[PDB]
Amino acid sequence: LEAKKEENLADWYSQVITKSEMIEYHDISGCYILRPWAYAIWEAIKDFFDAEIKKLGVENCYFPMFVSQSALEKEPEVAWVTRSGKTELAEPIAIRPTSETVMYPAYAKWVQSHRDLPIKLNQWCNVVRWEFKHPQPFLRTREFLWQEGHSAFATMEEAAEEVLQILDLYAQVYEELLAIPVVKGRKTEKEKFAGGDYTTTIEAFISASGRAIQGGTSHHLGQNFSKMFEIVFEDPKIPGEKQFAYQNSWGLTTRTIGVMTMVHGDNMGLVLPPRVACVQVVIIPCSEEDKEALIAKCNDYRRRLLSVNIRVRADLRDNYSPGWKFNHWELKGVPIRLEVGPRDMKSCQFVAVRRDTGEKLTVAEETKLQAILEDIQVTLFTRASEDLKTHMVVANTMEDFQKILDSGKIVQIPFCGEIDCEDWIKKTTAMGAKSLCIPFKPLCELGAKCVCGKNPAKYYTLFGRSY
Amino acid sequence: GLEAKKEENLADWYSQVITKSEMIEYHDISGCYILRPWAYAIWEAIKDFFDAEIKKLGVENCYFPMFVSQSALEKEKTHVADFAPEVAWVTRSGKTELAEPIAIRPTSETVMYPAYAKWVQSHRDLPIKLNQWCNVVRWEFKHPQPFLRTREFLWQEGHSAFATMEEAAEEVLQILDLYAQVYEELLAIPVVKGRKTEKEKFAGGDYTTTIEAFISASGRAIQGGTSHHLGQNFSKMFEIVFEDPKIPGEKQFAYQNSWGLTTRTIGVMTMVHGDNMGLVLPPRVACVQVVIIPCGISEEDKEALIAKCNDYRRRLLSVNIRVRADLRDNYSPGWKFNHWELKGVPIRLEVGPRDMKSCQFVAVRRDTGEKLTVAENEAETKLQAILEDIQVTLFTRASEDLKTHMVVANTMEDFQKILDSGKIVQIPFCGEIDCEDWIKKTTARMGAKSLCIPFKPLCELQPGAKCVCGKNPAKYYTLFGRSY
Numbered sequence: 001l002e003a004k005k006e007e008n009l010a011d012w013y014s015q016v017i018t019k020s021e022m023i024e025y026h027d028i029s030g031c032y033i034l035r036p037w038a039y040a041i042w043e044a045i046k047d048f049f050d051a052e053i054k055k056l057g058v059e060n061c062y063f064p065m066f067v068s069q070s071a072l073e074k075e076p077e078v079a080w081v082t083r084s085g086k087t088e089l090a091e092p093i094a095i096r097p098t099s100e101t102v103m104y105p106a107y108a109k110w111v112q113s114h115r116d117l118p119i120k121l122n123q124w125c126n127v128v129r130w131e132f133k134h135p136q137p138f139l140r141t142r143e144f145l146w147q148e149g150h151s152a153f154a155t156m157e158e159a160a161e162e163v164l165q166i167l168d169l170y171a172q173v174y175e176e177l178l179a180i181p182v183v184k185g186r187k188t189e190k191e192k193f194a195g196g197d198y199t200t201t202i203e204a205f206i207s208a209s210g211r212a213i214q215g216g217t218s219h220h221l222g223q224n225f226s227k228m229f230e231i232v233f234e235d236p237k238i239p240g241e242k243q244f245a246y247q248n249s250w251g252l253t254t255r256t257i258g259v260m261t262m263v264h265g266d267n268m269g270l271v272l273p274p275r276v277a278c279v280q281v282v283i284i285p286c287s288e289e290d291k292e293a294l295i296a297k298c299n300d301y302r303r304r305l306l307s308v309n310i311r312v313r314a315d316l317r318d319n320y321s322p323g324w325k326f327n328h329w330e331l332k333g334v335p336i337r338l339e340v341g342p343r344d345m346k347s348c349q350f351v352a353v354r355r356d357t358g359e360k361l362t363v364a365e366e367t368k369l370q371a372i373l374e375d376i377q378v379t380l381f382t383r384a385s386e387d388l389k390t391h392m393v394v395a396n397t398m399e400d401f402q403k404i405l406d407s408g409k410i411v412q413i414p415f416c417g418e419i420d421c422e423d424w425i426k427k428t429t430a431m432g433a434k435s436l437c438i439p440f441k442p443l444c445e446l447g448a449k450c451v452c453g454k455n456p457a458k459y460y461t462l463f464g465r466s467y
Numbered sequence: 468g469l470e471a472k473k474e475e476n477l478a479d480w481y482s483q484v485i486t487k488s489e490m491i492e493y494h495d496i497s498g499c500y501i502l503r504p505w506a507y508a509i510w511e512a513i514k515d516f517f518d519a520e521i522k523k524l525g526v527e528n529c530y531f532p533m534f535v536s537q538s539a540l541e542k543e544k545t546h547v548a549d550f551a552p553e554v555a556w557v558t559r560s561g562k563t564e565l566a567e568p569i570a571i572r573p574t575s576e577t578v579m580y581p582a583y584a585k586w587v588q589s590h591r592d593l594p595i596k597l598n599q600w601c602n603v604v605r606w607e608f609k610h611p612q613p614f615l616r617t618r619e620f621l622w623q624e625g626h627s628a629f630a631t632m633e634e635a636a637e638e639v640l641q642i643l644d645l646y647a648q649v650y651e652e653l654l655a656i657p658v659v660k661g662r663k664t665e666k667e668k669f670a671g672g673d674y675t676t677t678i679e680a681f682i683s684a685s686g687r688a689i690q691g692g693t694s695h696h697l698g699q700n701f702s703k704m705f706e707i708v709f710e711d712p713k714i715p716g717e718k719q720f721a722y723q724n725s726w727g728l729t730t731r732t733i734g735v736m737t738m739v740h741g742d743n744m745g746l747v748l749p750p751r752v753a754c755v756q757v758v759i760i761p762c763g764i765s766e767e768d769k770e771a772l773i774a775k776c777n778d779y780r781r782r783l784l785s786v787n788i789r790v791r792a793d794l795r796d797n798y799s800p801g802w803k804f805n806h807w808e809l810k811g812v813p814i815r816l817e818v819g820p821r822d823m824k825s826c827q828f829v830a831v832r833r834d835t836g837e838k839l840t841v842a843e844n845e846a847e848t849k850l851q852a853i854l855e856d857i858q859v860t861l862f863t864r865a866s867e868d869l870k871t872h873m874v875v876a877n878t879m880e881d882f883q884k885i886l887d888s889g890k891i892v893q894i895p896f897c898g899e900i901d902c903e904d905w906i907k908k909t910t911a912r913m914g915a916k917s918l919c920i921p922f923k924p925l926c927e928l929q930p931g932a933k934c935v936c937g938k939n940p941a942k943y944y945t946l947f948g949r950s951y
């Protein structure tokens with residue numbers, strides 16, 4: 001790897017994602033191939049989150065990719081299919097940018113009584129938003145994989161409960177799987193989903209860019225969509241009266257992998273948190289009778305490790321040098337390299353090198369390796385945490401806000417929350433700073449006025465430059 | 468209640484069964500359907516099995532883009548021209564024309580193989596074995612049918628490249644055998660492995676292998692999955708090539724395979740096993756294998772009966788049986804019976820107060836309807852045994868059905884008679900496109916298509932035997948019939 005993360009972050013990022021064999025470019029802008037090394041991380045995320053939402057009663061299903069004009073405009077850079085071969089469709093049809101308008105008519109038909117609620121459905125699928133701004137692999141693409149969950153309840157408080165549960169699962173994905181610290185909160189009036197009541201969100205910070213990025217989102221839709229699509233049930237108490245269902249929706253994408261790359265990656269390449277590493281430990285070999293024995297010693301380690309449920313690969317290819325293999329698996333971010341040399345074989349001991357720090361370490365010919373893995377995870381998280389702690393500070397006045405913002409940090413400011421003030425904050429700080437979230441647990445507690453002067457502060461709000 | 472008979476109007480029965488089992492919901496765009504959880508969980512079971520099996524072969528999962536540029540789609544002879552009117556084109560985003568229109572993938576060769584060519588710089592870069600689960604689109608005007616033939620559908624498509632022919636040949640048959648395991652072992656559906664004829668194979672490939680299944684309610688056959696050897700056709704098209712230094716001065720074009728399997732599986736499961744009470748789920752893929760329902764419904768006694776149903780639920784989960792306790796006050800027990808029968812749940816566990824007070828329950832089989840009174844303490848064992856026996860039974864019945872409806876015939880006379888009887892036929896066949904066209908055209912006065920050239924035909928072909936056309940010698944016994 002040539003480019004340096006602190007010099008030329010875009011070039012560093014492209015080189016990391018391709019030389020780690022995560023991404024390949026497609027001949028259509030903003031579309032990328034997810035190679036197995038990237039996809040396996042998505043598979044790990046999927047296994048965790050799918051089990052967890054199943055524990056909450058959510059069922060998986062698959063709705064059509066195509067949205068009619070009427071369904072879509074029953075409420076915009078949607079991709080329109082307008083012909084098959086050379087012959088025009090009777091009416092153009094749209095590729096889903098999200099599936100509310102595909103799902104909620106079906107919900108309306110399935111709900112007859114309050115006995116039919118709640119409905120909790122999730123799908124793992126692809127969506128398309130065909131914007132013409134600059135794409136970035138993983139972080140912001142035209143086609144992407146995600147999961148979208150869509151719930152409908154009889155009451156408001158079970159919906160609110162789910163909203164917070166799903167947000168906490170997203171925070172778990174980032175913090176426990178990817179070792180990325182996030183700040184939970186809710187979007188401002190300006191930035192919230194216009195189709196919902198409130199939008200909760202997890203925001204992560206990428207310091208090499210000094211920019212924030214949304215990691216996931218969980219919306220309380222309230223009765224907005226149920227009144228739109230007539231998702232109604234009869235009142236269990238009052239004859240002949242109908243109630244509109246309360247709804248949530250929530251989503252999470254492969255952006256995860258990009259954030260994991262941006263946060264933990266270094267100038268040797270990818271750095272994989274052991275919890276999502278497709279390969280946690282790579283075994284590399286360093287008298288011909290002796291050579292055969294060495295290979296057999298590696299296979300011994302491999303089988304043992306496989307037996308202790310550690311994801312492991314023995315790279316015994318004859319065609320490549322050990323130093324080549326060292327660099328290959330470092331670039332890919334394998335948390336531990338296990339080096340087996342003849343002396344050490346003879347000494348019945350071995351060497352383990354951790355990817356995060358490079359700390360080498362000799363050990364006796366199972367237990368240790370697992371112990372190293374966990375520490376690597378903790379290490380990654382705590383460093384990311386310190387980075388966030390360094391780059392997220394309080395400022396009580398605009399001038400202090402601006403200086404700090406220009407130092408490449410994100411700032412919690414007292415904020416009145418009006419949309420006009422938020423646009424003013426954007427252009428005065430000019431790209432300009434946007435609102436990220438109103439944090440659940442702000443750093444310091446809030447008579448204080450907004451940084452606009454004209455109005456009092458309603459809440460500490462986190463602002464920053466953002467992807 | 469279903470109130471439509473499978474032996475009368477098969478189409479209406481199918482529609483009723485897939486909707487009333489809560490498998491399918493209709494969409495306002497023809498040929499696209501909502502897969503509700505009851506069916507999507509069957510696809511997820513198939514997925515878990517096939518994923519595990521291909522990983523043991525060294526296949527890795529990935530995800531390539533859904534959009535194909537016009538240049539990449541039209542670049543090589545990847546597919547015949549007759550497919551052109553069935554490609555769906557995105558021509559605008561919002562209100563603004565795209566400079567170049569882009570196509571939705573009907574299959575991903577034109578997206579993957581330029582990448583494969585970039586990735587093969589030497590022998591060490593082979594083999595490449597990649598699979599993806601994803602949706603594809605084929606915008607046909609022919610009458611769609613849920614699960615069986617739709618405009619959008621879910622599938623897996625595997626694409627692999629090798630240094631030698633032997634490796635690729637081996638994988639083709641391994642994957643075909645995996646598809647046969649999906650059908651016979653998970654779905655309880657017997658299939659016939661074989662080779663597609665010249666007319667019916669994938670045109671740009673060297674040969675296509677296939678598994679064919681029979682639907683006796685319709686007298687038709689349908690292809691369950693496919694596994695192609697491409698040889699070096701696509702690698703010479705896309706320049707997926709390396710150099711062996713021990714063979715200076717010769718290119719080595721990769722040998723490739725591709726293979727595919729869709730949600731048609733579920734449709735075939737519905738058509739083979741479904742009866743006049745609704746769906747019938749093979750225990751192996753049933754989302755719920757056992758549903759516990761309280762019957763015969765004092766306040767203390769009611770509390771106790773519900774606790775007992777939950778005891779059964781706990782024990783069944785603890786021995787890895789997928790179980791649902793239907794404890795809803797809103798619906799009658801006889802309605803619960805009907806509802807879970809429509810959905811095809813293999814076993815219904817009835818618990819009444821008299822049975823609770825004698826430590827027993829009733830188990831009712833979905834496939835036969837047979838009722839058994841079972842002692843409480845044997846719940847885990849008996850119920851497991853019964854599930855296995857349901858699986859077996861379904862497969863056995865279907866195989867019996869296949870074996871009576873597939874027979875050998877040696878003349879166009881016998882062939883057309885047996886064909887008209889609603890069966891499929893293994894005939895001696897010369898293999899030529901003209902003569903297959905002729906077989907179809909004649910036997911209409913729809914015509915019979917070829918299904919597959921079986922690896923293991925019923926009867927070995929006689930030497931010098933001539934194909935039913937009488938003009939050419941038979942090259943092989945070939946399974947023909949009316950088809951989906």
Ligand SMILES: Cc1cc(N2CC[C@@](C#N)(C3CC3)C2=O)cc(NC(=O)Cc2ccccc2)n1
Nearest residue numbers: 129131133135140141142144215216251252253
């Ligand atoms: C990969 C990815 C992710 C996401 N988004 C959105 C919010 C969200 C979060 N959190 C989803 C709710 C879960 C997320 O991840 C969004 C996107 N593309 C786009 O906006 C389209 C686009 C394309 C090119 C340039 C500019 C914009 N692309």
Ligand SMILES: Cc1cc(N2CC[C@@](C#N)(C3CC3)C2=O)cc(NC(=O)Cc2ccccc2)n1
Nearest residue numbers: 605607609611616617618690691692727728729
């Ligand atoms: C559900 C499903 C399945 C399959 N096919 C194909 C062969 C194969 C097998 N075996 C694939 C290799 C895996 C299969 O299952 C094909 C399809 N639609 C279509 O052709 C498009 C269409 C749309 C409306 C009416 C008629 C035709 N729809």
Ligand SMILES: O=C(C[C@H]1NCCC[C@@H]1O)Cn1cnc2cc(Br)c(Cl)cc2c1=O
Nearest residue numbers: 076077078097098129148149217249250251
């Ligand atoms: O997609 C959403 C709302 C939520 N849906 C379920 C998963 C989580 C997700 O945030 C917001 N959104 C975002 N981008 C969009 C782009 C287009 Br184009 C359209 Cl039509 C609609 C939308 C649109 O509704």
Ligand SMILES: O=C(C[C@H]1NCCC[C@@H]1O)Cn1cnc2cc(Br)c(Cl)cc2c1=O
Nearest residue numbers: 546550553554573574605624693725726727
């Ligand atoms: O899709 C195939 C060949 C194989 N691709 C890999 C997975 C298994 C599959 O059988 C054949 N086929 C089928 N239908 C098609 C429809 C269209 Br539209 C196009 Cl352009 C092309 C095709 C086309 O190539």
Ligand SMILES: [Br-]
Nearest residue numbers: 097098217251
């Ligand atoms: Br969104």
Ligand SMILES: [Br-]
Nearest residue numbers: 573574693727
């Ligand atoms: Br196909």
Ligand SMILES: [Ca+2]
Nearest residue numbers: 549550553607
């Ligand atoms: Ca055709």
Ligand SMILES: [Ca+2]
Nearest residue numbers: 537566567568
């Ligand atoms: Ca053009």
Ligand SMILES: [Ca+2]
Nearest residue numbers: 021591592593
């Ligand atoms: Ca490789």
Ligand SMILES: [Ca+2]
Nearest residue numbers: 715716717718
């Ligand atoms: Ca030559």
Ligand SMILES: [Zn+2]
Nearest residue numbers: 036037040278
């Ligand atoms: Zn992998």
Ligand SMILES: [Zn+2]
Nearest residue numbers: 416421450452
């Ligand atoms: Zn203000």
Ligand SMILES: [Zn+2]
Nearest residue numbers: 504505508754
């Ligand atoms: Zn289910």
Ligand SMILES: [Zn+2]
Nearest residue numbers: 823824825826
């Ligand atoms: Zn007793």
Ligand SMILES: [Zn+2]
Nearest residue numbers: 897902934936
């Ligand atoms: Zn002939």
